[PDB]
mmCIF file of C-alpha atoms in Angstrom:
data_model
loop_
_atom_site.group_PDB
_atom_site.id
_atom_site.type_symbol
_atom_site.label_atom_id
_atom_site.label_comp_id
_atom_site.label_asym_id
_atom_site.label_seq_id
_atom_site.Cartn_x
_atom_site.Cartn_y
_atom_site.Cartn_z
ATOM 1 C CA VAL B 1 -21.302 107.614 128.981
ATOM 2 C CA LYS B 2 -23.097 105.384 132.654
ATOM 3 C CA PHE B 3 -22.116 106.343 135.811
ATOM 4 C CA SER B 4 -24.054 104.495 138.389
ATOM 5 C CA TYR B 5 -23.701 105.078 142.075
ATOM 6 C CA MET B 6 -25.146 102.645 145.050
ATOM 7 C CA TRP B 7 -25.114 104.250 148.863
ATOM 8 C CA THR B 8 -25.785 103.589 151.881
ATOM 9 C CA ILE B 9 -26.701 105.526 154.974
ATOM 10 C CA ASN B 10 -26.021 103.538 157.787
ATOM 11 C CA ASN B 11 -28.969 103.909 161.247
ATOM 12 C CA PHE B 12 -30.439 106.576 158.632
ATOM 13 C CA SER B 13 -33.940 106.098 161.926
ATOM 14 C CA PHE B 14 -31.568 107.949 163.975
ATOM 15 C CA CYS B 15 -29.753 110.682 161.933
ATOM 16 C CA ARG B 16 -29.790 114.459 164.523
ATOM 17 C CA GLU B 17 -29.353 116.344 160.585
ATOM 18 C CA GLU B 18 -31.996 119.309 161.432
ATOM 19 C CA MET B 19 -33.947 120.720 158.300
ATOM 20 C CA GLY B 20 -31.838 122.435 156.213
ATOM 21 C CA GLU B 21 -28.902 120.330 157.655
ATOM 22 C CA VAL B 22 -26.680 117.553 154.740
ATOM 23 C CA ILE B 23 -25.203 114.835 154.325
ATOM 24 C CA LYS B 24 -23.251 113.824 151.435
ATOM 25 C CA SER B 25 -21.513 111.178 149.596
ATOM 26 C CA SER B 26 -18.269 110.793 148.471
ATOM 27 C CA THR B 27 -18.073 110.737 144.860
ATOM 28 C CA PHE B 28 -18.288 108.471 142.357
ATOM 29 C CA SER B 29 -16.966 108.359 138.440
ATOM 30 C CA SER B 30 -17.510 106.933 135.107
ATOM 31 C CA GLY B 31 -13.389 105.049 135.909
ATOM 32 C CA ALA B 32 -12.977 106.334 131.951
ATOM 33 C CA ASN B 33 -10.981 108.660 130.841
ATOM 34 C CA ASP B 34 -14.209 112.047 131.170
ATOM 35 C CA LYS B 35 -12.406 112.688 134.165
ATOM 36 C CA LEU B 36 -15.651 113.288 135.825
ATOM 37 C CA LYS B 37 -16.170 113.322 139.752
ATOM 38 C CA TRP B 38 -20.231 113.179 141.126
ATOM 39 C CA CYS B 39 -21.652 113.237 144.707
ATOM 40 C CA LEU B 40 -24.782 112.458 146.124
ATOM 41 C CA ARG B 41 -26.771 114.988 148.669
ATOM 42 C CA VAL B 42 -29.074 114.514 150.912
ATOM 43 C CA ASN B 43 -31.457 116.401 153.693
ATOM 44 C CA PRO B 44 -32.587 113.874 155.857
ATOM 45 C CA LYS B 45 -35.465 116.284 156.785
ATOM 46 C CA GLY B 46 -35.100 118.465 153.499
ATOM 47 C CA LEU B 47 -33.688 121.276 152.382
ATOM 48 C CA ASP B 48 -36.442 123.630 153.872
ATOM 49 C CA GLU B 49 -39.571 124.631 155.491
ATOM 50 C CA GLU B 50 -40.870 124.031 152.172
ATOM 51 C CA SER B 51 -39.872 121.049 152.326
ATOM 52 C CA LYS B 52 -39.618 119.494 155.823
ATOM 53 C CA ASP B 53 -41.683 116.588 155.171
ATOM 54 C CA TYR B 54 -39.761 115.452 153.031
ATOM 55 C CA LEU B 55 -36.011 114.044 152.122
ATOM 56 C CA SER B 56 -34.761 115.420 149.397
ATOM 57 C CA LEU B 57 -31.870 113.992 147.407
ATOM 58 C CA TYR B 58 -29.180 115.971 144.904
ATOM 59 C CA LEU B 59 -26.737 115.042 142.200
ATOM 60 C CA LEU B 60 -23.478 117.669 142.230
ATOM 61 C CA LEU B 61 -20.505 117.551 140.048
ATOM 62 C CA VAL B 62 -17.478 118.154 142.098
ATOM 63 C CA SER B 63 -15.371 118.320 139.586
ATOM 64 C CA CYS B 64 -15.461 118.764 135.714
ATOM 65 C CA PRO B 65 -12.446 119.513 133.466
ATOM 66 C CA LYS B 66 -14.075 121.767 131.255
ATOM 67 C CA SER B 67 -17.041 124.266 131.936
ATOM 68 C CA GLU B 68 -20.361 122.182 131.998
ATOM 69 C CA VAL B 69 -22.280 119.153 131.525
ATOM 70 C CA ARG B 70 -25.136 117.872 130.308
ATOM 71 C CA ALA B 71 -26.359 115.180 132.506
ATOM 72 C CA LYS B 72 -28.982 112.803 132.988
ATOM 73 C CA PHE B 73 -30.041 111.429 135.978
ATOM 74 C CA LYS B 74 -32.472 108.726 138.114
ATOM 75 C CA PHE B 75 -32.056 108.416 141.400
ATOM 76 C CA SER B 76 -33.750 105.573 143.174
ATOM 77 C CA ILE B 77 -34.028 103.089 146.587
ATOM 78 C CA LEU B 78 -33.615 99.792 147.250
ATOM 79 C CA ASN B 79 -36.328 98.274 149.511
ATOM 80 C CA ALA B 80 -35.921 95.091 151.703
ATOM 81 C CA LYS B 81 -36.906 92.765 149.295
ATOM 82 C CA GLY B 82 -33.709 93.475 147.340
ATOM 83 C CA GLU B 83 -35.660 95.460 144.518
ATOM 84 C CA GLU B 84 -35.180 98.912 143.387
ATOM 85 C CA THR B 85 -37.975 101.289 144.543
ATOM 86 C CA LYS B 86 -39.333 104.889 144.516
ATOM 87 C CA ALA B 87 -37.167 105.776 141.033
ATOM 88 C CA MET B 88 -37.001 108.859 139.103
ATOM 89 C CA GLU B 89 -35.456 110.547 136.651
ATOM 90 C CA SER B 90 -34.507 113.793 135.318
ATOM 91 C CA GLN B 91 -37.746 114.308 132.557
ATOM 92 C CA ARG B 92 -34.366 115.300 130.141
ATOM 93 C CA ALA B 93 -30.556 116.941 130.337
ATOM 94 C CA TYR B 94 -29.521 119.458 132.689
ATOM 95 C CA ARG B 95 -26.624 121.683 132.912
ATOM 96 C CA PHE B 96 -24.307 121.052 135.517
ATOM 97 C CA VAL B 97 -21.134 123.182 136.140
ATOM 98 C CA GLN B 98 -18.314 122.375 139.030
ATOM 99 C CA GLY B 99 -20.436 122.869 142.863
ATOM 100 C CA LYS B 100 -23.828 123.140 141.383
ATOM 101 C CA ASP B 101 -26.201 120.240 142.334
ATOM 102 C CA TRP B 102 -29.580 119.307 140.703
ATOM 103 C CA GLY B 103 -32.420 116.720 141.656
ATOM 104 C CA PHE B 104 -35.667 116.465 144.236
ATOM 105 C CA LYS B 105 -36.683 118.410 146.964
ATOM 106 C CA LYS B 106 -39.086 116.773 147.642
ATOM 107 C CA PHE B 107 -37.537 113.174 146.874
ATOM 108 C CA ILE B 108 -39.660 111.331 148.997
ATOM 109 C CA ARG B 109 -42.058 111.834 151.987
ATOM 110 C CA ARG B 110 -40.244 110.881 155.825
ATOM 111 C CA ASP B 111 -42.892 109.324 157.281
ATOM 112 C CA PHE B 112 -43.358 107.159 154.106
ATOM 113 C CA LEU B 113 -39.552 106.311 154.892
ATOM 114 C CA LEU B 114 -40.324 105.661 158.531
ATOM 115 C CA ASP B 115 -43.399 103.256 158.009
ATOM 116 C CA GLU B 116 -41.916 99.630 158.223
ATOM 117 C CA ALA B 117 -44.875 98.304 156.012
ATOM 118 C CA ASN B 118 -43.290 99.974 153.188
ATOM 119 C CA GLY B 119 -39.509 98.594 153.962
ATOM 120 C CA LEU B 120 -37.567 101.338 153.027
ATOM 121 C CA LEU B 121 -34.646 101.268 155.982
ATOM 122 C CA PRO B 122 -34.449 97.695 156.253
ATOM 123 C CA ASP B 123 -31.460 97.223 159.282
ATOM 124 C CA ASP B 124 -31.817 100.910 159.093
ATOM 125 C CA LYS B 125 -30.047 102.209 156.359
ATOM 126 C CA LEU B 126 -31.163 103.857 153.066
ATOM 127 C CA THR B 127 -29.546 102.536 150.265
ATOM 128 C CA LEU B 128 -29.693 105.076 147.685
ATOM 129 C CA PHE B 129 -29.509 104.450 143.499
ATOM 130 C CA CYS B 130 -28.106 107.114 141.352
ATOM 131 C CA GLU B 131 -27.415 106.436 137.482
ATOM 132 C CA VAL B 132 -25.670 109.038 135.813
ATOM 133 C CA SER B 133 -26.045 109.625 131.594
ATOM 134 C CA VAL B 134 -23.825 112.383 129.890
ATOM 135 C CA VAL B 135 -23.948 112.376 126.100
ATOM 136 C CA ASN T 1 -53.802 118.757 150.287
ATOM 137 C CA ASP T 2 -50.464 118.645 148.214
ATOM 138 C CA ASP T 3 -48.737 115.282 150.726
ATOM 139 C CA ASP T 4 -48.088 113.226 147.295
ATOM 140 C CA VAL T 5 -44.771 110.379 148.340
ATOM 141 C CA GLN T 6 -43.188 111.854 145.870
ATOM 142 C CA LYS T 7 -43.004 114.812 143.805
ATOM 143 C CA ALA T 8 -40.767 114.855 140.423
ATOM 144 C CA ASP T 9 -39.786 118.498 139.833
ATOM 145 C CA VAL T 10 -36.103 118.675 139.629
ATOM 146 C CA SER T 11 -34.844 121.757 141.200
ATOM 147 C CA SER T 12 -30.870 123.569 142.066
ATOM 148 C CA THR T 13 -30.336 124.409 146.387
ATOM 149 C CA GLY T 14 -27.752 127.074 144.667
#
């Protein structure tokens, strides 16, 4: 079962969040009968000291009807040219339980994201995509 | 330096 989600964070260059602080997306679902609910969590200034130079990006399982979900996922960024870039995928399915996340503590360097030459914050918005695949 | 633009390692925040 596939899930796709697009998240636009407005005014991203002005986030006040300090290292360790998190912004959470709305939930998304398959639209089908599996009852699974997901959301994204980003740390604009990284999860922790080790990752302070990075944006940290995670997929969170918000609800599932039984105990565990195995899912593959992929995150990418929309650029100013209208294309998905910097996509990274889980190389395998990971085991999710309700309230548990998986993702990339070092998803993209902040100094790359903020360099206008890379076009990743058009109109100062960060647009992220997430694809989820559940067995 | 270990300053790649991205790192592909998957982890969980717990």
